[PDB]
Amino acid sequence: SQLKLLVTRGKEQGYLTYAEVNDHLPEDIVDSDQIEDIIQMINDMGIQVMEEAPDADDLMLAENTADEDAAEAAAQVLSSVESEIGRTTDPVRMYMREMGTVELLTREGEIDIAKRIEDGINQVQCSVAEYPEAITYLLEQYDRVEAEEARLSDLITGFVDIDPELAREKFAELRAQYVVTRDTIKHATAQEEILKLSEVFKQFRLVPKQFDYLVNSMRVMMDRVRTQERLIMKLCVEQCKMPKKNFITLFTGNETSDTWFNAAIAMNKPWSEKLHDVSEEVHRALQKLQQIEEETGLTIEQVKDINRRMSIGEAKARRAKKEMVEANLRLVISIAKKYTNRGLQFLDLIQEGNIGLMKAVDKFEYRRGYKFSTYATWWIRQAITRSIADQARTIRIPVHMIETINKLNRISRQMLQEMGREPTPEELAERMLMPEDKIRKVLKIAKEPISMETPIGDDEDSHLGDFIEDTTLELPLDSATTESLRAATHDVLAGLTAREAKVLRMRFGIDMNTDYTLEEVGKQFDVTRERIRQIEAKALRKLRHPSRSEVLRSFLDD
Amino acid sequence: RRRKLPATIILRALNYTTEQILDLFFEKVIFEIKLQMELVPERLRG
Amino acid sequence: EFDAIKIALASPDMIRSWSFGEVKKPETINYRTFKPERDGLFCARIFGPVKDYECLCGKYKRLKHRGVICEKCGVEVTQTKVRRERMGHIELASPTAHIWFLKSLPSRIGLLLDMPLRDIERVLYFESYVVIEGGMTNLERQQILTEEQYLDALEEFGDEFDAKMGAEAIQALLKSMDLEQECEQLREELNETNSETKRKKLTKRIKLLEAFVQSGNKPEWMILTVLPVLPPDLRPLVPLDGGRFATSDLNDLYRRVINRNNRLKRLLDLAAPDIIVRNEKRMLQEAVDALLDNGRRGRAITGSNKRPLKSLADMIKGKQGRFRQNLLGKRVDYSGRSVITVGPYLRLHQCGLPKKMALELFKPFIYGKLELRGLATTIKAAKKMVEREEAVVWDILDEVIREHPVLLNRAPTLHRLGIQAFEPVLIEGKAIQLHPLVCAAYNADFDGDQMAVHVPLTLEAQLEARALMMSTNNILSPANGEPIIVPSQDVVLGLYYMTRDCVNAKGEGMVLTGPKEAERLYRSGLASLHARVKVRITEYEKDANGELVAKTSLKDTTVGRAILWMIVPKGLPYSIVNQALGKKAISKMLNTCYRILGLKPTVIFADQIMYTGFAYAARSGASVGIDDMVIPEKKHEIISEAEAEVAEIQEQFQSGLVTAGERYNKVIDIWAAANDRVSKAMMDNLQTETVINRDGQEEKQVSFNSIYMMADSGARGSAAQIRQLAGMRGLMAKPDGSIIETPITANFREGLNVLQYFISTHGARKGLADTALKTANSGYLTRRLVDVAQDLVVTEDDCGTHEGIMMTPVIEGGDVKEPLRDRVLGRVTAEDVLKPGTADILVPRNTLLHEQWCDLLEENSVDAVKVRSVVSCDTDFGVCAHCYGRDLARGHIINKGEAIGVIAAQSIGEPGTQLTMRTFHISSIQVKNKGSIKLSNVKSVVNSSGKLVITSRNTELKLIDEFGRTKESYKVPYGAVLAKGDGEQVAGGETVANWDPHTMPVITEVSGFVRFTDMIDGQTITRQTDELTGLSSLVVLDSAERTAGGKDLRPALKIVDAQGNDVLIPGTDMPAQYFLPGKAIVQLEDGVQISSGDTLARIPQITGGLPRVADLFEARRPKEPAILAEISGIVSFGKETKGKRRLVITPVDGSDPYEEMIPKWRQLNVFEGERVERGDVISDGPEAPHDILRLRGVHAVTRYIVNEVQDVYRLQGVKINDKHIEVIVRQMLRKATIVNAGSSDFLEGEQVEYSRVKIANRELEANGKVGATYSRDLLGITKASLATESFISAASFQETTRVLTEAAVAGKRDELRGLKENVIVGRLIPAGTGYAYHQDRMRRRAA
Ligand SMILES: [Zn+2]
Ligand SMILES: [Zn+2]
């Protein structure tokens, strides 16, 4: 205990200097962040931790609030951080700490984790291409872009073979392969025919969006079966206490007909008679399970093996590609140290780098054999500078328009010395080929402009918010002018009769929220808007006269 | 303005030993035998 | 309209309920058109239109479309002022802890989860996994699992193991925590855990738990999941000049949160690796901390400016925050300022307003009166007319200005006479002209001060101005009721010059028919202004039934006193103007006119005094010249004498006879005595001139020298500055406090040479620095006292108590520093006061002791009056009108609804700024008067030789004359050599006591033989062999170097018979042995003939300033607290030196648990067989005030403080009525601690508001059950202000975040009921004319 003697000495003398805390810090902690966190911990007692020997009156003037419960929980803290050394809360320091825990990669380790990614997505495509309705969608997609509803060489990346005629060749390959398998289902070589049907697709080259569509469409056709596997198990083992060996034997393995369930309503058990609770429920799952069998050409247990090939292969490669992502985190931090002081915080530049680093891995091709630290350096050069372009100023500037200023910042700095004293704005019309107005609005744009806690200062500690005036308010001279104009109209319209005042109250919006038109006022009285226009012009001429306009003419600003 | 160290540490880091430090900062009346102390005539005041 | 303001925690559904949409993009505006975006930070679909009744698209721009929502941009056609009040929400993609509920120091989340703060801040920043309802898989719920430990404990356990990190973990902890289930199990273990720390922690947690169930908040609401954004008109994006803009920093913080939430949204859309999403969630949590409070986590992030950003906490908290800087200190229309000038043609009730300022301030008044009379038709015509300022708008404005006060206010508004209302008189020029009498009430001189002038608009505020704030309604100082409109410097020179006689002036010895003849003689130039004549004077006296009995006599006056008699009203006698009439004499004259005649004739009299003083000071021609400083001719001789003396002591320091310290002390004393000698010579040279004569002989008289005429009248300054003009300057100080030993033998009628002028600048620069540093902290104490005393308003007419302090004047030793007529005046008699015959009631009860009653009881020589005090009032949240007394700014009894807490805060603060801002410490009894001696605690013994030595402890001396009142009050030492007997009236000039601090005997009661038993030298005594005479001395020892064989045992001073039989104590069956504490000089022998009262065992041997009134109110515990006698009963010692001695006071009929840890360095007043009652002295020195409240009554810490605070005020000379310290003390100790909880609904260890205790105990005794007893607590005035009831009030002087978090988690309410509450809220105060409005609203609730 030394920091407890620091607490006791501070409350025993009414102050603390920097010398007393620096003599009562422990031996293990080094850097200045944590020790001024400790200064805050002792400073909100508050025992007035300031620099020098304090004055004489300012211990009796300075007050000690609030005894003692904040000091109770601070004693609970300060007698307990005398044990561990690794405590800080900074995401930058803790990010350096949890980033050093991942080692780098070699060249060989990089390409073999890349081929782990390649064989992982190959296992995913093995699970995809082992399903027929994806290739039925491929049939109907090539059919719908046979009418050129899309662009097929943009819908698929040609094929892995540039030309639509060879894209026609491999699709004429498909429909012949499809009919020598599906038409000859009637089961000896039919699954071998689907096998040859599966082989001809794994040399087709597509777009990931037109790849991900059929993956997620069978995903909702997968978890529906996983909902069916939930629909049985949530309502057999716990609903009725049917034992799971009746679930392990009867359902699990067969899964197909209406025999694993509806024959168990005669097992002479509590749960067997309790299946009448769930006989009508899973009869909806007795059809919709086999409806999926009407949508695969296979059985449900063969679907349970298809997505389990898909899930584990995805869980291998996405973990593999994150093992490549985690390895090159030391690369990204070296790049973001060069882009730091241009507006955005340090952790934000980094986290936009790992976003492109994840996207660089998805488009990295190790068959080219270049190093990965040359490919991902392009994306982090984009993604850091793009988020510096997109998300750094309080007023968002479009990305190219930043490059207009950045080219202007790069050129006008160069003509500051290559010309003489200053570069004029009209001189910059000569150097860059922007014609003196699309160069002028570039320099009209502000820069993260001014705070409104901006000290003016030394007036009343006044800030810049104290002197900005609102022009869009209502000054009470104009408002009482407007209010007295409301009553001065009401007395001039007291000098008119029933009809002419009322059209003049509904041609404009006088105590009604329109401003009807000439026919609309004439719609009320069935007049074809001509006498209504005259009786407006008659009453308007009636209000033109002196000693009829003796109050209103003064109401006009003259 | 860091933590304190006892200020003979800065003399020891400058390679001064204990007898050399006392050689610097003190005055030496010497005792001998029987039981004689040589006197400085001013040094007695207290 | 709302009647209460309720604080809670925001539900996430409620945050979405306030919202008008979601902010999704961190764009603010369009950057090209400066237009609001589609879903950006300054959205228009969410917050509204940028222009009033106009869409962003442009289609439905008509005022006919009001209320519709456009189909192209989604905005609603409304006013653009609706985006001042429209919020949106931010649905955060991950939960995030509220940093107010985490990094507060009580840390409500941490205190709630039964986990320390390091636990939750480790889990929240993604280090540790946390078990939430972990089944039965070998774990503990709410446990830290570090990452590797979680991984290897997930092994061998197929259960899902329920371990989260981050705010998902803390949210599922806070949701799954049942508060009331935990309350029942906590009370269940509270049934079986009566320890100290265990029971303390259990009840300490259960307090927040019982509040959290009774509030209605949910604990999962502390973890935020959806974030409210401010309206865009509270973080605006104003377009400035030249294309430049200006935003608030909340825009940057909300942009940071929207950026990190969008990126976290993508990083959880992307199935990223967990470390970068951990870093993203931790970053977003940090951004929420920086947005809500930029700096409670560390560090406060700076933008493109190197100051930290202002966050939402920083927008409510702080000096510049809305709670301080915008809820009270706010600019005001219908106001203006200009400099002040004198213009003394005014009356007391008018200021001189300029004409351009009255044209500007009174503009709507001018418009209404100008078009009502119809000189303009349109308000545009009125605007153009008074912009032209035609010849008629001055007539309309002087019509408007007639009886319409203006609040003239000067800036350091220390008290309520800084704002007074004046009727405005239109002058030209541009300076406010201001009546010269109230310049001493504003402390406003004419070296260029500016007074701000406001206008009261309403008839209620016009009548508040006229009825309270008019400068004639406030002519008594509210601190002490003396008039504050004292004529200050030129008026007193005029009144002193006309009324001060001359020995041979023109027109001596004439006889005039009255003052009319006197003014006719003076104004024609036949008589001088001061010539002793015999004027016939008609002076009226109302010494009857309000009669004004007239009486005409023939007085021996001067001419000018007769001329001044014309302006006197009737009720005053002539002898009040028959004198010199300096400054204090005009103060007493205006005071007499007020006390006799009332308020209006005092105002007319003060105006006529001011006019006559200026006029006859003008006709004085009172110049100042270079021959008005007569340098004394003996000044050269006193300077040469002191130079010869310091030459002699310079020799005797060169000779080594004295050292340099004593030589510096001797030359400082010599030069200061020479400076006093020179000042005495010049002041005797100046105040007596020689004039000649009626008979031609030499005749001394008081000199008409204008510098003496200014110093002696009290016009300006005093004889110290006249010493620095004519006499020598003196010894000059240093900023070190030291004194420059080479003095300044010159002055200011001669010059100063370069050395003395460089010497003077140390003291003058220190004085001006301390002046200009004190004015930057003028009303810090006034602020600190209005915080404690905000909500004290007189609410009751008479509560009907019988208690109160019993007031007696400050007789400290000789004289009385402040008599009874100063204190007991205006207070209410708590009892019936009888005559000294103890036979008839003098003043009945419930009486306002005015000056007639106090004159009566001072004629009856009454001495012990029990006033009605504020600290013993029987009403709640207020005082009654009689337990306070009278108003002192009016002379009447107080009204119902005067804010006496704020008034007393100002009347301690505004006289308190006249105190020094830095603190400063400074044989036989001199028997002078004669009379009877009274003694309390009187148990004396006779001696054989006729002398006396008192053997009772606190027998202090009281001398009474034949008048009842005390004459000489002193502390008699324990056994000092008295020549005083008992009770017999002695004559003055004979010593009553020969004290010696070397003499504290243990003088006997009965005569006899002092033999010694249990007496061993060596282990109890020292070997004391006095060679001095050859006497047997046994001087006893402390616990230092004796044995432990005789340490606990005590030596016997046993006085026995001539045979050796143990004589009894008279009254007590114990023996006669007087066992001794440390260091007693004993001369005894075994078996020597000594008498009763023999000298057996003798024992050997004012701060001022404003920091003292700082430390007296904060109630500091001094480092040497005079320890007391905690309980009545006779005393014994305790354990010898385990660091501290113990001392067991043993009550003869009660238990004795108190063996107090007494240090041996603070020596005993008492012997260890000496009976002292409770509240009696043990140590010597500054008595701690809490010990006065615990032991003695509440009138003994009330009497202690208001005599110790007034010992600071009367030390400097500042007078203040002691109501004002009593309402602060009454609001100080409104805390009681419970000890017997009884059938009352409070805990044992509970500190609560005392007037809630006294009403529950009023009602729970009003049933057939019995109520609690309580021990009163007293606190400091920065700590008493902490425990307010309100949270809107408390957040304006305390730290807002700790206040608002403590208020929110309690689900607290604020029925407003307070001065600072309703001022912020915008209602009437519950004090003033708005008391009846708070009756009118407290009528409709009991409907
Ligand atoms: Zn629109
Ligand atoms: Zn009362």
DSSP string, A134-171: HHHHHHHHHHHTTTTSS-HHHHS-S-----HHHHHHHH
Q: What is the 3-state secondary structure (H, E, C) of A184-246?
A: CCCCCCHHHHHHHHHHCCCCCCCCHHHHHHHHHHHHHHHHHHHHHHHHHHCCCCCCCCCCHHH
Tell me the C-alpha distance between C89 and C230, whole Å: 9
For C864-1001, list the strands marked E by DSSP: 865-868, 879-880, 920-921, 932-935, 940-942, 948-950, 957-960, 966-970, 977-978, 993-994
Both tokens of residue C48? 């509204």
For the CA of C75, the nearest ligand: 1
Tell me the C-alpha distance between C950 and C977, whole Å: 9
What phi, psi does C43 have (nearest 5°)?
Answer: -80, 165
* Residues of chain C positioned with their CB less than 8 A from the CB of A82: none
A441 CA → ligand 1 middle, Å:
28
Subunits with 3+ Cβ pairs within 8 Å of B are A
Please indicate if any CB of chain A lies within 8 Å of the CB of C1343: no
CB contact under 8 A, B4 and A23: yes
C61 CA → ligand 1 middle, Å:
8
C342 contact partners, CB below 8 Å, separation of at least 6: C433, C434, C436, C446
3-state secondary structure at position C650: helix
Both tokens of residue C1285? 């009831």
* Residues of chain B positioned with their CB less than 8 A from the CB of A18: 1
Handedness of CA A482, A483, A484, A485 (dihedral sign): positive
Please indicate if any CB of chain A lies within 8 Å of the CB of C279: yes
* Residues of chain C positioned with their CB less than 8 A from the CB of A87: 118, 122
CB contact under 8 A, C105 and A98: no
Other Cβ atoms closer than 10 A to A365: 10
CB A11 within 8 A of CB A47: yes
Please indicate if any CB of chain B lies within 8 Å of the CB of A19: yes
Please state the separation of Cα A166 from the chain's center in Å: 41
Angle at C538 between CA C536 and CA C540, to 5 degrees: 155
CB C1261 within 8 A of CB C1267: yes
Q: Which chain C residue's Cα is nearest to A43?
A: C105
Touching pair C, A by Cβ (3+ pairs < 8 Å): yes
Please indicate if any CB of chain B lies within 8 Å of the CB of A50: no
C853 CA → ligand 2 middle, Å:
20
Report whether A440 belongs to an annotated binding site.
no
Q: What is the dihedral of CA A245, A246, A249, A252, to 10 degrees?
A: -100
C1336 CA → ligand 1 middle, Å:
48
**Residues before each break in chain C (C–N > 2.5 Å)?**
922, 1101
User: How many contacts, defined by CB atoms under 8 Å, are there between A and C?
Assistant: 207
Q: Which chain C residue's Cα is nearest to A61?
A: C1110
Partner-chain residue, chosen from A67, A394, A554, that has the shortest CB–CB distance to C252: A394
Please indicate if any CB of chain C lies within 8 Å of the CB of A475: no
Method by which the model was determined: cryo-EM
3-state secondary structure at position C384: helix
CB C1114 within 8 A of CB C1277: yes
Mutate to test the interface with C, among A47, A451, A477 (most CBs of C within 10 A): A451
List, as one string, the DSSP characters of C944-983: TTS-EEE-SSS--EEEE-TTSSEEEEE---TT-EE---SS
Question: Domain containing C1304 — which CATH number?
Answer: 1.10.150.390
Please identify which residue in the block is written with the tokens 């004409």.
C355
- Residues present in chain B in total: 46
For C676-824, list the strands marked E by DSSP: 688-691, 699-702, 730-733, 739-744, 794-796, 806-807
* Residues of chain A positioned with their CB less than 8 A from the CB of C379: 477, 480-481, 484
Task: Give CA separation, C79 vs A209, C52, C54, C803, C1262, in Å.
Answer: 47, 4, 8, 62, 59
Touching pair B, C by Cβ (3+ pairs < 8 Å): no
Mutate to test the interface with C, among A35, A399, A452 (most CBs of C within 10 A): A452
Q: What is the 3-state secondary structure (H, E, C) of C425-485?
A: EEECCCCEECCCCCHHHHCCCCCCCEEEEECCCCHHHHHHHHHHHECCCCCECCCCCCECC
Q: Is A48 exposed, middle or buried (0-12, 13-18, 19+ CB in 10 A)?
A: middle
CB C1073 within 8 A of CB C1053: yes
Owning domain of residue C1326: 1289-1341
Both tokens of residue C906? 């100002």
Subunits with 3+ Cβ pairs within 8 Å of C are A
Amino acid at A422: E
CB C522 within 8 A of CB C1255: no
Please indicate if any CB of chain C lies within 8 Å of the CB of A315: no
Quoted resolution (Å): 3.5
Q: Which chain C residue's Cα is nearest to A36?
A: C298
Q: Is A1 exposed, middle or buried (0-12, 13-18, 19+ CB in 10 A)?
A: exposed
Pair type for strands C993-994 and C977-978: antiparallel
CB contact under 8 A, B1 and A18: yes
Tell me the C-alpha distance between A88 and A34, whole Å: 7
CB C78 within 8 A of CB C48: yes
List, as ranges, residues 18-37 from B with C-beta within 8 Å of A. Answer: none
CB contact under 8 A, B1 and A23: no
* Distance from the A276 Cα atom to the nearest Cα atom in chain C, whole angstroms: 31
Both tokens of residue C53? 């009744």
Question: Domain containing C673 — which CATH number?
Answer: 1.10.132.30
C66 CA → ligand 1 middle, Å:
12
Amino acid at A322: K
* Residues of chain A positioned with their CB less than 8 A from the CB of C51: 472
Please indicate if any CB of chain A lies within 8 Å of the CB of C430: no
Q: Which chain B residue's Cα is nearest to A18?
A: B1
* Distance from the A70 Cα atom to the nearest Cα atom in chain C, whole angstroms: 5
Q: Could you give the angle at which helices A399-412 and A372-390 cross, rounded to 10 degrees? A: 100
Tell me the C-alpha distance between A273 and C1237, whole Å: 64
Long-range CB pairs of C268-272, under 8 A, 24+ apart, other chains included:
C268/C93, C268/C94, C270/A355, C270/A358, C271/A318, C272/A322, C272/A325, C272/A354, C272/A358
C1254 CA → ligand 2 middle, Å:
14
Closest to C1299 in 3D by CA, of C359, C638, C423, C316: C316
3-state secondary structure at position A80: coil
Long-range CB pairs of A221-229, under 8 A, 24+ apart, other chains included:
A221/A292, A221/A295, A222/A303, A222/A307, A224/A288, A224/A292, A225/A289, A225/A292, A225/A300, A225/A303, A225/A304, A228/A285, A228/A288, A228/A289
Peptide bond into C134 cis (omega under 30): no
C942 contact partners, CB below 8 Å, separation of at least 6: C948, C1092, C1093
CB contact under 8 A, A98 and C303: no
Please indicate if any CB of chain C lies within 8 Å of the CB of A143: no
Task: Give CA separation, C276 vs C97, C127, C268, C544, in Å.
Answer: 19, 14, 10, 98
Q: Is A236 exposed, middle or buried (0-12, 13-18, 19+ CB in 10 A)?
A: buried
Subunits with 3+ Cβ pairs within 8 Å of A are B, C
Pair type for strands B31-32 and C1097-1098: unpaired
List, as ranges, residues 752-781 from C with C-beta within 8 Å of A. Answer: 780
A224 CA → ligand 1 middle, Å:
44
* Distance from the A18 Cα atom to the nearest Cα atom in chain B, whole angstroms: 8
Q: Which chain A residue's Cα is nearest to C66?
A: A513
List, as ranges, residues 333-392 from A with C-beta within 8 Å of C. Answer: 343, 345, 347-348, 351-352, 354-355, 358, 391
Angle at C356 between CA C353 and CA C359, to 5 degrees: 90
| Helices first, then strands: H and E counts in chain B | 2, 2
Give the residue ranges of the annotated binding site of C.
55, 57, 70, 73, 445, 447, 449, 799, 873, 880, 883
* Residues of chain C positioned with their CB less than 8 A from the CB of A57: 917-919, 1107, 1110
List, as ranges, residues 114-133 from C with C-beta within 8 Å of A. Answer: 116-118, 121-122, 125
Bridge partners (DSSP) of residue C338 are C451
C49 CA → ligand 1 middle, Å:
9
DSSP designation for C323: I
C912 contact partners, CB below 8 Å, separation of at least 6: C781, C782, C1106, C1109, C1209, C1214
Give the residue ranges of the annotated binding site of C for Mg(2+).
445, 447, 449
A523 CA → ligand 1 middle, Å:
29
Burial A484-499 (b: 16+ CB within 10 A, else e): bbeebbeebbeebeee
